Amino acid sequence: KNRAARVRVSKGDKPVTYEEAHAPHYIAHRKGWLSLHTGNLDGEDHAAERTVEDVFLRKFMWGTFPGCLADQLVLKRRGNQLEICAVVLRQLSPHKYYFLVGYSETLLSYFYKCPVRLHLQTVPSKVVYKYL
Amino acid sequence: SFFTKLTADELWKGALAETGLNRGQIIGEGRYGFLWPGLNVPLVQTIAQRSKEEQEKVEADMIQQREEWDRKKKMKVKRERGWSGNSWGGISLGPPDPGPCGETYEDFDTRILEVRNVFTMTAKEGRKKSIRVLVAVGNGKGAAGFSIGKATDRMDAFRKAKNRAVHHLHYIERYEDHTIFHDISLRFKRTHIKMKKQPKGYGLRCHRAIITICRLIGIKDMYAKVSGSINMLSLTQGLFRGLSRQETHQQLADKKGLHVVEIREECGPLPIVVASPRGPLRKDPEPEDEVPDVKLDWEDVKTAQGMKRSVWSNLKRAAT
Amino acid sequence: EDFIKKQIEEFNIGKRHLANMMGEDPETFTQEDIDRAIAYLFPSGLFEKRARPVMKHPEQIFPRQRAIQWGEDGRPFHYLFYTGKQSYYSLMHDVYGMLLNLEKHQRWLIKEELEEMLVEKLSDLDYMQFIRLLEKLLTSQCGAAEEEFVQRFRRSVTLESKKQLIEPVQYDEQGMAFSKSEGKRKTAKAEAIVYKHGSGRIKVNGIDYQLYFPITQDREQLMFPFHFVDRLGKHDVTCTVSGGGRSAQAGAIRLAMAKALCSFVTEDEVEWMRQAGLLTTDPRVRERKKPGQEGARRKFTWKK
Amino acid sequence: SRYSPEFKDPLIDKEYYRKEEKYVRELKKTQLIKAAPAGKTSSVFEDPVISKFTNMMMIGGNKVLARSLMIQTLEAVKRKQFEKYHAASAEEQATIERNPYTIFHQALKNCEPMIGLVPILKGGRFYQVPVPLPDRRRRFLAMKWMITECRDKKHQRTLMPEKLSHKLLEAFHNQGPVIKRKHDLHKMAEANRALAHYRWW
RNA sequence: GGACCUGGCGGUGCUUCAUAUCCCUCUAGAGGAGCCUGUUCUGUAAUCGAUAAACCCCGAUCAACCUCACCACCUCUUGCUCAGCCUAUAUACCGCCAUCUUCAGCAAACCCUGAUGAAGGCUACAAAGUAAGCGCAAGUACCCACGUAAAGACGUUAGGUCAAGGUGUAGCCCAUGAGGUGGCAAGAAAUGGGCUACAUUUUCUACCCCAGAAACGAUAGCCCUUAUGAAAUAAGGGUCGAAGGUGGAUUUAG
Ligand SMILES: C[NH+](C)c1cc(NC(=O)CNC(C)(C)C)c(O)c2c1C[C@H]1C[C@H]3[C@H]([NH+](C)C)C(O)=C(C(N)=O)C(=O)[C@@]3(O)C(O)=C1C2=O
Ligand SMILES: [Mg+2]
Ligand SMILES: [Mg+2]
Ligand SMILES: [Mg+2]
Ligand SMILES: [Mg+2]
Ligand SMILES: [Mg+2]
Ligand SMILES: [Mg+2]
Ligand SMILES: [Mg+2]
């Protein structure tokens, strides 16, 4: 059986989000992409280092906003304006939130050498598309 | 390589193998201890870093707090014993779950009587376990009943059994709210239950299931001997059959048209009227059938004549 | 429900806000223009036309929530409540009653459509019995009232038409008359120009049919429409052709000449040659090899 | 199949298409029709038997080489029969026939079998049981026997038109290996005239 | 021991079917020859893993050195690393799959039946079943609504991989870890899969199907040159000019 990105059915008590619920055959039929970088089009050079930096961003922001990122991020990349739009929860204090925003806001700018911008989007509870 | 690291949710899924732990941390605590201004310490505007003494004392407090945490995991919970430890037979599940019909069962006690691991064979899986449980519910005022719950999980079976028995209750009539009206001999299938009405203070000298059931019913003093097959799911059913098919004193008085009167040896020759007919009184006296044709029990006659020699019979046991 | 009411309010206010950001601030922003505005506003790029964003009245978005069937007395409203199928059994009772009183005097709905009108789940045999009683009522000589009953249950058909689309005659060039049709078969394309008179001549990519088609099978393919319509040496052609192979090009030409000669032959005979099978495209195209096979349907060696 | 099941068969017949079955005509003008294959043609030089023999002679998709080995055979037939009328005699001539189409057709009709053998399993042993063959099966059998008796490999350097012309003139004159093997099938069925009771159909 | 419940089986009955599968049938092959490439066995100082269906041009969309974990010899000790280990266990696992599946079932929660047993729950002119959820279906991709794709749950087979990576358990840290240098990939034999043939619908040349002529077969072996590379496997030419006469049982695919 195919076991790639398919959360199996439990007993009907398993909260799950649109992203996790959809399987890889819906990857742009129903889901779309979580990272919008241009390198995977027909003619371009640097797609490999874009992905190497992509997995880095996913894991840095995962370990730097500890246990508050509701679902996964949207690493869009237009011009030299990398963007880390988020869906972060409403549990930690806003001064801590603004702090980790600033810390990231400048640290990825000095790691990747371009404008990096985080536009958080606070949400009360981790969303549920269906209970599996 | 930070690139080859992974989420903890994924590390444990592999460590436990249950498909065939970071909570004590503040948001900026570092080994180096560079206590920041947005994390840990609040937002005078002065960056700083604690010293070798404050670090060691704080991390010592943290490791001790871990130790007390493994203590609050490794306490002991006290389970009351039912009929033995590692059994389920006297275990009191709580009150039955409140009815969704705006209802409540709070004066009702549920006690298990039998837990069995029950299996069937499937074409794909093979041996498939299903827990089968029997529970009895009672408020000590006459209303009691039993039911079977079956599930794959024991908690689900318990819930099904008790929430079904409250809908399948009986009503047992009691003499003076302590004993049964008469002596009941009943054979249900291949289980023989023989119960005797007994005076006050006799205690519940019955089979342990009968003791739990009669504590849920409110019967305090009775003798009971079971013979034949001791199946629990025939024992409870025969017990409830006999106790719900008792004949009371007022029904006997109404059926015969005569006074039902008592003669205790404790009071004396004094007649104590317990039930008079609610209609007319029959004036032909009861026929004194000399040498009555009644089927007697050889165990009762053996005990009467003193030829019942057992090293097990009248043993000094605990209360009820 | 209060949910439905505030969703409605929010659509109305958001629809007016939608015409502001665009430019149709005058009050009448239609649903087509709404779909147009959201398309542009946030580009989709998702294959499922339901997985894309949307802005409809909550009515169509949220489903039909059935009303409460009993007030604050208990006392359910419909008399056939304890059947659990009030609407269906009321309809069956009514249809039986109209059959009865009509006997004293003297396409069809799909199951999902009937369930939508009744707002109740239905068995297939329940649907079958309903349709049977309704057919009993039309077969029986019924009046205009029971006619409007049968016709509110019967729906549309949407018949199509299978007459070949005739190309207009282009009276052009210097003063000649032609029709310029197209044909396609197995990655081959053929645009053909057929003049009404001219007694026979093809110019497939500049040369004649005996030069572009050395194979007599190809020449037979080029004969085919004329020899069917008995106009062999009575018109003349010129064809441009790209792609394919020696037989695909000839088939594309054959289709193009037939679909151009349609304008020069009568409508009964264009129907006749459509029946003969010269006016329909051939959908037989090469398939795809599959990963783990040795061809499109061909597999490898041993599998059992 | 790339056609939907509602796609119908096209029919190509001039004598039909000129004028009971009126409802069939109206229904056919209301059905979808599918495309016509390349092999069929509104000519009346064609014989479907001839095209079927060409398709069965085809090796690996070479209809070119197939029709070639067919047109050369037909020519060579006409040449020899024409030599015949030429070298013949007052009466002999009127008897000799030279249409390469009738000679092929009638040689096939003399080649076709009327009975067949089916292997039937009974009691472990296999038995050869006589059976009525269908018309399609016996026509296919005649054609396939002709093609295999051309590719027998006992012809050495002989070219395919020479092989098929010689074999087919022999078959028209009711001699040769194809008539011999039809007679052999018939004679074996006779050996097996009782085992026919093994049939259940 | 008696009697059952459920499932599996039956060289188990009746009926209805399979359709590229069940047979009779239809087309092209395998099995026979040579070559290529895996595997077994033998060999070597010389990895490991797959091993009926569901291993056998399989991890490899790929090993002259590198790869590389193998072997030989010689060296290194806080070692690219708050070390490491391709050490052992796939019978601790995550991960990603095979298989049934070229299936339609898996089911929370209730309710009834069985004297309240394992269990079972069918009759549309209807006798207790109601059902959220997953799956088929539906909707999508490609050229259509057709076909092909994708998809196919629960579980089965402790089926495949600790060697992709991560990793529990047990182990090593003078070692089982680290580096350098040179070799390992040969056939008395066998077998799996392909490629090319045994020619005459063929062979060579033009042409890319209207000719001339012949009347066969190594992508092996040896020699020359070239490509790439520090260092030759590949490519072209030369040479030669094998066995081979369309392959039994069985079998494959459509
Ligand atoms: C000896 N048997 C009982 C066995 C044992 C183990 N593992 C252990 O018991 C070891 N346990 C320790 C390490 C001591 C903790 C085993 O781990 C195994 C097996 C059986 C094999 C059989 C394998 C075989 N394959 C190689 C062809 C086979 O016939 C099949 C099959 N389905 O085709 C298998 O099941 C098999 O592959 C297999 O899985 C086995 C084991 O895994
Ligand atoms: Mg698969
Ligand atoms: Mg104990
Ligand atoms: Mg193994
Ligand atoms: Mg090692
Ligand atoms: Mg597939
Ligand atoms: Mg599907
Ligand atoms: Mg195993």
| Three state DSSP letters for B157-187 | HHHHHHHHHCCCCCCCCCCCCCCCCCCEEEE
C-alpha A24/C-alpha A4 separation (Å) is 7
Would you state the structure tokens that stand for residue A67, as one six-digit string? 């246990």
Do the chains contact at A99 and B7, CB–CB below 8 Å?
Answer: no
C-alpha A73/C-alpha A54 separation (Å) is 10
What backbone phi and psi angles, to 5 degrees, belong to C291?
Answer: -70, 115
Query: CB of A86 within 8 A of CB of A61?
Result: yes
Return the number of other C-beta atoms located less than 10 Å from residue D45's C-beta. Answer: 8
Distance of CA A42 to the CA centre of its chain: 25
Contact between chain B and chain C (3 or more Cβ pairs less than 8 Å apart) = no
Kindly list the residues from chain C whose CB atom is less than 8 angstroms away from the CB atom of residue A28.
Answer: 45-47
C-alpha D116/C-alpha B264 separation (Å) is 109
C-alpha C29/C-alpha C23 separation (Å) is 10
User: B86 in helix, strand or coil?
Assistant: coil
| Min Cα–Cα distance to chain C from D16, Å | 11
CA of C82 to C1' of E117 (A): 35
Query: CB of A6 within 8 A of CB of A19?
Result: no
| Min Cα–Cα distance to chain C from D199, Å | 32
Do the chains contact at D64 and C215, CB–CB below 8 Å?
Answer: yes
Protein residue nearest nucleotide E151, by CA to C1': A25
Query: CB of C167 within 8 A of CB of C182?
Result: no
User: D132 in helix, strand or coil?
Assistant: strand
C-alpha B12/C-alpha B303 separation (Å) is 67
DSSP state of C67: P
Determination technique used? cryo-EM
Residues in chain A: 132
D→C interface, C-beta within 8 Å: 2-3, 10-12, 14, 17, 28-36, 38, 41-43, 63-64, 67
- Burial label for A92, CB within 10 Å (0-12, 13-18, 19+), is middle
> Nucleotides on strand E with an atom closer than 7 A to protein CB?
5-8, 24-28, 53-54, 61, 82, 92-100, 102, 108-112, 114-120, 124-126, 131-134, 139-141, 143-157, 165-168, 192-194, 200-202, 209-210, 215, 246, 251-254
Q: Measured between CB atoms, which of C162, C221, C278 is closest to D38? A: C221
Query: CB of C250 within 8 A of CB of C212?
Result: no
Would you state the structure tokens that stand for residue D132, as one six-digit string? 């009525």
C-alpha B147/C-alpha B236 separation (Å) is 10
CA atoms within 13 A on the CB side of B127: 5
User: Which residue's structure tokens are 């039309």?
Assistant: C138
Ligand 6 centroid to Cα of residue A35, in Å, is 29
Distance of CA C161 to the CA centre of its chain: 12
Q: Which helix (H) or strand (E) holds B196?
A: strand B191-197
Residues in chain B that come right before a backbone break, where C and next N are over 2.5 Å apart: 20, 43
Return the number of other C-beta atoms located less than 10 Å from residue B182's C-beta. Answer: 14
Residues in chain D that come right before a backbone break, where C and next N are over 2.5 Å apart: 19
Contact between chain B and chain D (3 or more Cβ pairs less than 8 Å apart) = no
Show the 3-state SS of B207-228.
Answer: CHHHHHHHHHHCCCCEEEEEEE
**Nearest-Cα residue of chain D relative to residue C228:** D42
Distance of CA B127 to the CA centre of its chain: 29
C-alpha A113/C-alpha A119 separation (Å) is 19
Would you state the structure tokens that stand for residue C298, as one six-digit string? 């061909």
Would you state the structure tokens that stand for residue C258, as one six-digit string? 């037939």
C-alpha A88/C-alpha A74 separation (Å) is 12
Does residue C47 approach strand E to less than 7 Å at its CB? yes
- Cβ of B27 under 8 Å from any chain A Cβ? yes
Biggest CA-to-CA distance, chain B: 111
Nearest to C255 by CA among C220, C285, C279: C279
Query: CB of C171 within 8 A of CB of C177?
Result: yes
Return the number of other C-beta atoms located less than 10 Å from residue C278's C-beta. Answer: 26
C-alpha D113/C-alpha D145 separation (Å) is 11
C-alpha B114/C-alpha B111 separation (Å) is 10
Q: Measured between CB atoms, which of A55, A62, A96 is closest to B27? A: A96
What backbone phi and psi angles, to 5 degrees, belong to B146?
Answer: -115, 160
The partner residues of A119 in beta bridges, in order of sequence, read none
CA atoms within 13 A on the CB side of C169: 12
The partner residues of C237 in beta bridges, in order of sequence, read C194
Region class of D147: left (phi > 0), else alpha (psi between -120 and 50), else beta: alpha
The partner residues of B130 in beta bridges, in order of sequence, read B118
Return the number of other C-beta atoms located less than 10 Å from residue A71's C-beta. Answer: 16
Does residue C158 approach strand E to less than 7 Å at its CB? no
Does residue C285 approach strand E to less than 7 Å at its CB? yes
C-alpha B249/C-alpha B274 separation (Å) is 7
Q: CA dihedral in degrees (A64, A70, A76, A81; nearest 10)?
A: -40
Do the chains contact at C280 and D34, CB–CB below 8 Å?
Answer: yes
> What b/e sequence results for B82-92 when a residue is b if at least 16 CB atoms lie within 10 Å of its CB, and e otherwise?
beeeeebbbbe
Ligand 7 centroid to Cα of residue D39, in Å, is 39
CA distances from C79 to B135, C75, C83, C89 (A): 41, 9, 9, 10
C-alpha D9/C-alpha C65 separation (Å) is 50
C-alpha B275/C-alpha B258 separation (Å) is 9
Biggest CA-to-CA distance, chain C: 94
Ligand 7 centroid to Cα of residue B19, in Å, is 28
Query: CB of C256 within 8 A of CB of C191?
Result: yes
C-alpha D18/C-alpha B312 separation (Å) is 113
Q: Find the angle CA(D64)-CA(D65)-CA(D69) to the nearest 5 degrees.
A: 120
DSSP state of D38: S
User: D195 in helix, strand or coil?
Assistant: helix
CB-based contacts of D97: which residues, under 8 Å, 6+ apart?
Answer: D81, D103
Q: Which helix (H) or strand (E) holds B133?
A: strand B127-138
**Nearest-Cα residue of chain A relative to residue C51:** A30
Query: CB of B135 within 8 A of CB of B146?
Result: yes
Would you state the structure tokens that stand for residue A56, as one six-digit string? 């880095």
Query: CB of C182 within 8 A of CB of C281?
Result: no
DSSP result, B98-124: PPTTT----S-EEEEEEEEEEEEE-SS
Sign of the dihedral defined by the CA atoms of residues C185, C191, C197, C199, in that order: negative
CA distances from D148 to C76, D142, D155 (A): 85, 10, 12
User: B292 in helix, strand or coil?
Assistant: coil
Query: CB of B109 within 8 A of CB of B138?
Result: yes
Q: Which helix (H) or strand (E) holds B92?
A: strand B92-93
Sign of the dihedral defined by the CA atoms of residues C59, C62, C64, C70, in that order: negative
Across all strands, nucleotide nearest D137 (CA–C1') = E25
Query: CB of B190 within 8 A of CB of B199?
Result: no
CA of C285 to C1' of E200 (A): 35
Contact partners of B by the rule of 3+ C-beta pairs under 8 A? A
The partner residues of B188 in beta bridges, in order of sequence, read B191
Query: CB of A74 within 8 A of CB of A61?
Result: no
- Burial label for C17, CB within 10 Å (0-12, 13-18, 19+), is exposed
Region class of B264: left (phi > 0), else alpha (psi between -120 and 50), else beta: beta
Q: At how many Å resolution was this determined?
A: 2.9
Would you state the structure tokens that stand for residue C244, as one six-digit string? 């394919």
CA of C293 to C1' of E30 (A): 17
CA distances from D76 to D44, D55, D160, D162 (A): 22, 20, 11, 7
User: Which residue's structure tokens are 């050869």?
Assistant: D128
The partner residues of D116 in beta bridges, in order of sequence, read D131
User: Which residue's structure tokens are 């827990």?
Assistant: B131
Would you state the structure tokens that stand for residue B11, as one six-digit string? 């590390």
C-alpha C196/C-alpha C261 separation (Å) is 8
H runs (alpha helix) in chain B: 8-16, 52-73, 154-165, 208-217, 232-244, 249-256, 298-305
Does residue C297 approach strand E to less than 7 Å at its CB? yes
Q: Which helix (H) or strand (E) holds D131?
A: strand D125-132
Does residue A28 approach strand E to less than 7 Å at its CB? no
Reduced DSSP (H G I as helix, E B as strand, rest coil) percent helix, strand, coil of chain D, to 5 = 55, 10, 35
Pairing state of beta strands B191-197 and B184-188?
Answer: antiparallel
What backbone phi and psi angles, to 5 degrees, belong to D126?
Answer: -95, 140
Ligand 1 centroid to Cα of residue B125, in Å, is 20
H runs (alpha helix) in D32-62: 48-57
C-alpha C10/C-alpha B317 separation (Å) is 76
Gyration radius from chain B CA atoms? 32
DSSP result, A10-61: -SS--EE-HHHHS-GGGIIIII--SEE-GGGSSS-S-HHHHHHHHHHHHHHH
Do the chains contact at A59 and B5, CB–CB below 8 Å?
Answer: yes
Terminus-to-terminus CA distance in chain A, angstroms?
Answer: 18
H runs (alpha helix) in D88-194: 90-95, 100-111, 135-150, 160-172, 177-191
| Min Cα–Cα distance to chain C from D28, Å | 7
DSSP state of B200: T
User: D78 in helix, strand or coil?
Assistant: helix
CA distances from D17 to B184, B281, D25 (A): 100, 112, 10
Spell out which residues of D between 9 and 68 contact strand E, using CB within 7 Å.
56-59, 62, 64-66
DSSP result, C164-194: --PPPPEEETTTEEEEEEEEESSS-EEEEEE
Ligand 3 centroid to Cα of residue B226, in Å, is 27
Ligand 7 centroid to Cα of residue D63, in Å, is 41
Nearest to C35 by CA among C60, C10, C8: C60
- Cβ of B148 under 8 Å from any chain A Cβ? no
DSSP state of A107: H
Sign of the dihedral defined by the CA atoms of residues D63, D67, D70, D76, in that order: negative
C-alpha B146/C-alpha D158 separation (Å) is 99
Return the number of other C-beta atoms located less than 10 Å from residue A65's C-beta. Answer: 24
C-alpha C228/C-alpha C275 separation (Å) is 11
C-alpha B244/C-alpha B144 separation (Å) is 10
CB-based contacts of B275: which residues, under 8 Å, 6+ apart?
Answer: B248, B249, B250, B252, B253, B259, B260
**Nearest-Cα residue of chain B relative to residue A65:** B27
Region class of B192: left (phi > 0), else alpha (psi between -120 and 50), else beta: beta
Query: CB of B104 within 8 A of CB of B110?
Result: no
User: Which residue's structure tokens are 């393919």?
Assistant: C221
User: B272 in helix, strand or coil?
Assistant: strand
Would you state the structure tokens that stand for residue C8, as one six-digit string? 């409605």
Spell out which residues of C between 188 and 247 contact strand E, using CB within 7 Å.
210, 214-215, 246
Protein residue nearest nucleotide E92, by CA to C1': B17
C-alpha B98/C-alpha B75 separation (Å) is 31
Ligand 6 centroid to Cα of residue C291, in Å, is 9
User: C241 in helix, strand or coil?
Assistant: strand
